[PDB]
């Protein structure tokens, strides 16, 4: 998360960490939506085609964490994945459309002050909240600055970062990139003139983009961190998977 800030303890009890020791190559976020299901981006589970690997597992889902590096004993829980379901129409070498993936945990997790599921949006919520100018929250352990290897100053955060960004008008998203966006994704972030910065960056993908309903006091997952050209660039915005438009697939699979 670029230009974000340290989250407080228990701020996002639905934040899940996708980690892999060997190859270390993995850090992605995910969201806890039930005691047995985690939601992430389809691209965090794939490999380049010349790898020829399709087993997809050996990954650890660490739930309840705050610190990126430290092991949190009586707080975090590590679980194994029983099954992984990637949207059969996710397209990388194409539109980057339908970047969504669900994961069934081996055994259901047990909630606590640090672990708790987010609500998924319903027609009404989608209508009330998904409006240009309306702010959402993005959390993650990803890079603090745009980086291809190493960067100046610190690079990765020690604790979960949070940043609240505004949903941007579709036309503006459309005119901000050459990649053909689809109704299944939305963009958020500040415009250059709004004197505020913030963005998701490498390591944040899969994490949740949430909004609090001013009507029922509940947090809803409206998007999933997916892509963006760089991190926190002027005139550029981050794109998120439109959870509401994929809600039916989520339901069907579960």
């Amino acid at each position: 998360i670029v230009e974000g800030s340290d989250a407080e303890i228990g701020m996002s009890p639905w934040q899940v960490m996708l980690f892999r020791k060997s190859p270390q190559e993995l850090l992605c976020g995910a969201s806890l939506i039930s005691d047995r299901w985690v939601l992430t981006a389809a691209h965090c589970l794939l490999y380049p085609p010349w790898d020829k690997n399709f087993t997809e597992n050996d990954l650890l889902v660490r739930i309840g964490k705050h610190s990126r590096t430290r092991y949190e004993r009586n707080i975090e829980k590590i679980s194994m994945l029983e099954k992984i379901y990637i949207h059969p129409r996710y397209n990388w070498r194409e539109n980057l459309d339908r970047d969504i993936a669900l994961m069934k945990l081996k055994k259901p997790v047990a909630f606590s002050d640090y672990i708790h599921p987010v609500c998924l949006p319903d027609r009404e919520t989608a209508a009330s909240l998904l409006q240009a100018g309306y702010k959402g929250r993005v959390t993650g352990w990803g890079n603090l600055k745009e980086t291809w290897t190493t960067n100046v100053g610190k690079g990765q955060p020690s604790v979960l970062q949070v940043v609240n960004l505004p949903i941007v008008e579709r036309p503006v998203c459309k005119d901000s990139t050459r990649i053909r966006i689809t109704d299944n994704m939305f963009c958020a972030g500040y415009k250059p003139d709004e004197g505020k910065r913030g963005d998701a960056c490498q390591g944040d993908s899969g994490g949740p983009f949430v909004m609090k309903s001013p009507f029922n006091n509940r947090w809803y997952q409206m998007g999933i961190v997916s892509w963006g050209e760089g991190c926190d660039r002027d005139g550029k915005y981050g794109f998120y998977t439109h959870v509401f438009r994929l809600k039916k697939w989520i339901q069907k699979v579960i």
Binding site: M11, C119, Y134
Partner: protein, 31 residues
């Protein structure tokens, strides 16, 4: 489960508000 999804133990259930939460509410009231 879903029944009480979205209500964070250390916050909503305690009638506590995190430090930047209101910035979100403000943007809904004409943002």
């Amino acid at each position: 489960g879903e029944a009480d999804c979205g209500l964070r133990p250390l916050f909503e259930k305690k009638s506590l508000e995190d430090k930047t939460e209101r910035e979100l509410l403000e943007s809904y009231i004409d943002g």
